[PDB]
Design a protein around this ligand. Structure first.
Ligand code: A18
Ligand code: MN
Ligand code: MN
Ligand code: NA
Length: 263
């Protein structure tokens, strides 16, 4: 089944969601050519721990050694911060954050383009965010998650890109990952009708090339099989009576926090 968050739990989710979003707004100025992903991770952890007085849900997760996941270019997800990995002009980088505050999780990620952007990098990032946005605009009571996944896939493929099938969005609350699973493509296995109070994430992973991926021998890093670029954006939301409310909205987002479908 699915969990319906109480008004009180939703407020706690707003707090946690805001903190997760603020980690991304905070790190922005540091995402420069020459900086190491290891350094970015330390900055994020110190901020989460010393200033937000929260905890990273990534640290120790199944043995994961870092506080955030940082994925560059062909890396699809779960990139491990490393002091030896330096960002450079043209890189597209995803920093994925999940913090726990007052028992609840806030989960969000965004793409950052390093220094001088490349046209293809900007396009992939733009389309990926647009696929997340179109999905968010569909969220409202009564709609099926399958319809949303199908819409994301149709949009992405029309642009000549592909959607990663191995990973998905998910319910969230006192648990990092809870039911339901939010696939970003059409699937006969998906039959979930939304209800007010449900909290979950939408986080499509889009490849510029083919959908196939590969996991590295370090046990964490996932890359595109064809080494093409891959991008991802993620937001945590709560379903409302006439639409949804984005809990991890940032100043740079260009979609309303509260989306309504009523007249
Ligand atoms: O956004 C998510 O749901 C998400 C990102 C990363 C994870 C789980 C994970 C896998 C491999 C290494 C570290 C982590 Cl936190 O879950
Ligand atoms: Mn995440
Ligand atoms: Mn997530
Ligand atoms: Na990438």
């Amino acid at each position: 089944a699915i969990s319906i968050k109480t008004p009180e739990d939703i407020e706690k989710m707003r707090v946690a969601g805001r903190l997760a979003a603020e980690v991304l707004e905070m790190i922005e100025p540091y995402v420069k050519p020459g900086v190491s992903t290891g350094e970015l991770d330390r900055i994020c952890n110190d901020y989460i721990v010393n200033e937000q007085h929260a905890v990273s849900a990534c640290l120790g997760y199944h043995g994961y050694p870092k506080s955030v996941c940082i994925s560059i270019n062909e890396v699809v997800c779960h990139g491990i911060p490393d002091d030896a990995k330096l960002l450079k002009d043209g890189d597209i980088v995803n920093i994925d954050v999940t913090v726990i505050k007052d028992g609840f999780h806030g989960d969000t990620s965004k793409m950052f383009i390093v220094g001088k952007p490349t046209i293809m990098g900007e396009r992939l990032c733009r389309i990926t965010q647009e696929s997340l946005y179109l999905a968010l605009r569909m969220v409202k009571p009564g709609i099926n998650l399958r319809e949303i996944g199908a819409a994301i896939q149709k949009f992405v493929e029309a642009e000549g890109f592909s959607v990663v099938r191995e990973y998905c969005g998910h319910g969230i609350g006192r648990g990092f990952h809870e039911e339901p699973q939010v696939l970003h493509y059409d699937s006969r296995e998906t039959n979930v009708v939304l209800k007010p109070g449900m909290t979950f994430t939408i986080e499509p992973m889009v490849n510029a090339g083919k959908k196939e991926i590969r996991t590295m021998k370090d046990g964490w890093t996932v890359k595109t099989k064809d080494r093409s670029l891959s991008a991802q954006y993620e937001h945590t939301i709560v379903v409302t009576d006439n639409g949804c409310e984005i809990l991890t909205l940032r100043k740079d987002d260009t979609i309303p926090a509260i989306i309504s479908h009523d007249e």
